Symmetry: C3
Subunit: 345 residues, 3 copies
């Protein structure tokens, strides 16, 4: 009889995060979460390609859950009767029973309640894992998200100093494997089950057709760019449940980065690009110092520009010409430099 107070949590869709505290004086709680599996067709690129997705709570990625070390996490996983196949959930944050997967298999029309103790700090992947070849297929169909287990005293730099974020975003990256017809056009299917055989053939060759943030090419650009302001310290949680990624903030840095994502380790400082090993989450803090657009990418630039994996930040504030300035705008090349410039051919 676990005799701890209960605390409900209201999840929100990525890239935003439910309300939470960093440092807390609360004691351990039973933190109550609900995830509802949704099988649904989704648009994944700017040309309108559709996909038979499988998700937690209707999004790719599933929502970020936030708890503190020593909390107990009680998850009600629901599999609506309109879905077509069994699902479960594996928390990489949890200990035992294949992360929970061996205790959460549910058919359409069922729900189950799992409790796991948050004994390990960091950001962690969660994902569906029904068994055998269905494990990769459910994951790369969209059934993955992340959970953050904060120390009770919040984050620190590993050298005795507290670190605090003013804003948090969760960037879930998804590798997708979309069959093509003989002409090269992406194929559409009327159900996930119908897509499976052709999709497995693409999966086998290990080369995604799309690599996207928040479920679709362009999802976090334009009207949906991520907002920030000069002076704000922003935590960027990045997950990839199946395949490596190399995040980079174009025009910025990672001031403090937990590449492997685990807060019992000191973060690395001043990174250009970091590395999220497939099957994990990591996190980076950065304090914005300049206004403007920033692109946030995986720095395989082919994947970023051509397969979907670019987000934007729109940062308001005043430009700092000490950090960077255009000394001279574009102008003619002086003819007096001709010889000198021939040495650099």
């Amino acid at each position: 009889d676990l005799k701890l107070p209960r605390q409900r949590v209201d999840l929100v869709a990525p890239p935003f995060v439910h309300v939470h505290e960093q440092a807390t004086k609360q004691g351990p709680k039973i933190m109550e979460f609900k995830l509802v599996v949704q099988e649904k067709k989704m648009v994944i690129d700017e040309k309108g390609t559709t996909f038979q997705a499988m998700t937690f709570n209707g999004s790719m990625p599933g929502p970020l859950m936030v708890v503190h070390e020593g909390d107990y996490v009680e998850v009600t996983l629901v599999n609506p009767a309109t879905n077509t196949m069994p699902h479960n959930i594996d928390f990489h944050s949890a200990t035992g029973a294949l992360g929970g997967g061996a205790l959460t298999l549910i058919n359409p029309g069922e729900q189950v309640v799992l409790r796991w103790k948050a004994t390990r700090t960091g950001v962690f992947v969660y994902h569906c894992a029904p068994g055998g070849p269905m494990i990769p297929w459910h994951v790369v169909s969209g059934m993955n998200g992340a959970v953050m287990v904060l120390p009770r005293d919040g984050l620190n730099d590993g050298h005795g100093h507290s670190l605090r974020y003013d804003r948090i975003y969760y960037i879930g990256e998804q590798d997708l494997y979309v069959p093509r017809d003989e002409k090269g056009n992406f194929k559409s299917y009327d159900s996930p089950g119908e897509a499976y055989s052709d999709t497995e053939e693409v999966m086998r060759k290990l080369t995604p057709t799309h690599v996207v943030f928040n479920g679709k090419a362009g999802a976090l650009t334009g009207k949906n760019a991520l907002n920030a302001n000069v002076g704000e310290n922003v935590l960027i949680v990045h997950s990839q449940a199946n395949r490596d990624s190399r995040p980079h903030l174009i025009g910025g840095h990672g001031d403090y980065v937990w590449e492997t994502g685990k807060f019992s380790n000191a973060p690395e400082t001043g990174l250009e690009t970091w590395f999220i090993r497939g099957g994990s989450a990591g996190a980076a803090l950065y304090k914005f110092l300049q206004p403007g657009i920033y692109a946030y990418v995986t720095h395989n630039l082919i994947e970023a520009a051509n397969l979907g994996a670019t987000a934007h930040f729109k940062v308001e504030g005043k430009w700092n010409d000490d950090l960077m300035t255009q000394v001279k705008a574009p102008a003619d090349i002086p003819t007096g430099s001709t010889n000198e410039n021939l040495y650099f051919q």
Copy 2:
């Protein structure tokens, strides 16, 4: 005239490890090992696909060798007359002569004796490297293993505390490149030499057809699952001589992980998934806290489930419901939750 006592070592087949000490009061020794190259056809998957393998001591991976810092490692490498081509050995643990490869080239019917000083602690790859295109081909045909050079005082956590394992397993991961015919069926060959040209064509495209532990899909499952017990601290050495991997213990963690595999560095704590850069070995300690089956995978789940790269641990002991419990078994979704659940579509 190196005047140190000699100590023979009797190698055993992976994933087990020859008898050794962690901390030792022995002084430096000439540690004597023998490796015998074996070219042999091997079954690599559950459908019975065969492969012309090339191995050290008849296994994929070659056996784990264990010594201590400051030992000298005297290796007799033997190339039986029934083999068909030259072989050698490169120790990433060693200094000079291309790791030993430039001193160990032997034809069928020859043996050679190499000695190297174990000046660097950690787990390290060893592999054949005859020269030019034969280097990748011999490696991805199976000619790679690992050596562990322990500190004399055993492992520590980088923060002044000793770490000791109760059990050790060596997981060698192998990327394989098996030609297919026009219909997609894997092709068989009567000798390694006959397989070479078609195999190089597959290698060139950098996408393995199989990714296996201990030489074959399913090798470390079923009857050959890895045994452990709740309370035991288990060291899991993982190597990959040619290609990256991202190990994960499903239902567990890496309590202490040397991702780059080198014991002069403190391990990272509490990892979900780690990263073995191709051409290296790493190691993870984990103390089992729950009984049951665990899967140990590379967390490209396509490779794990569909190309062969899953092992199992079978852990005996008592379940701990404080760490994880099924609060409610699968049940109907209440109709009273309909509206609420519509917000998660």
Copy 3:
């Protein structure tokens, strides 16, 4: 009005590095550099395959720039009128305006001057990034290099001890995506623009046709091998602007390695193989202890041996038989060992 002394820098072609100091007593300077874009056909492999390359200063990689923390870096970027398209430059070392790219777009016949403050220590990638799909294309056509921002007191080991190199080399690794005809032969084009569509198709499948150091297979072998001597501490800077790499010095180690490349972090010690995440630079120090040839590779050995990614060091000095020796040259296998050797089949 930034009132600091100016210091010109004379760049040199990789793998060599312009003259510089490690520790310095100079105060902050405006360090003046010029890069001139060159579009040019280049030979990329030993069979004479040509490529429509795009470069900074005529080389792949672009030259290494070296400054100290707190310097201001004033770069004149020149786009000669004989080139065919716009170019710019993004410094991962810089803060704001997409690393400089949003302030440096120039047409053929133009030059621009950008200044950025070197507030972050480490080795960093710089690369062209005109916008959209041109970003990966310009990068994988050769438009990338690196900049090193040294602490003013030079490098240290993270444990209060200075580290100093006697020699520095910059190894830029380039993934190339060369179209083939129906027979498999590489195709030639009369301009970069003409190559683009076919090249993008290769890029999309994420598998390079070539992986090269210093712009071509064999560039840093034979007459162009890298020289060193026993006793010298050599810094090896490695960059990869678009794709992961796993450097390894065959016969050596990384004594001190900044895998993520950022000197505010302590280096790792005694690595066999390290990992350069695509979009970054890293660096390794190694003190040579044995003479001879060393190969320096990415340890995907297929890429190293078969797609171009092998360099050599030629190290002069005296062999140390204590570290490694051939105890017995190749000889017959004794018939007295037959039984014993049957246990290793």
